[PDB]
Amino acid sequence: XXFXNQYVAL
């Protein structure tokens, strides 16, 4: 919950 990617997603 900050724009991550497909595997690391926050």
PDB file of C-alpha atoms in Angstrom:
ATOM      1  CA  UNK A   1       0.000   0.000   0.000  1.00  0.00           C
ATOM      2  CA  UNK A   2       2.678   2.484  -1.358  1.00  0.00           C
ATOM      3  CA  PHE A   3       2.891   1.257  -6.238  1.00  0.00           C
ATOM      4  CA  UNK A   4       4.562  -2.159  -5.946  1.00  0.00           C
ATOM      5  CA  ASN A   5       4.806  -4.879  -8.592  1.00  0.00           C
ATOM      6  CA  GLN A   6       3.157  -8.239  -9.356  1.00  0.00           C
ATOM      7  CA  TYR A   7       5.128 -10.202  -6.741  1.00  0.00           C
ATOM      8  CA  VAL A   8       5.878  -7.560  -4.100  1.00  0.00           C
ATOM      9  CA  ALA A   9       2.665  -5.670  -3.597  1.00  0.00           C
ATOM     10  CA  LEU A  10       2.103  -3.132  -0.789  1.00  0.00           C
TER      11      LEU A  10
END
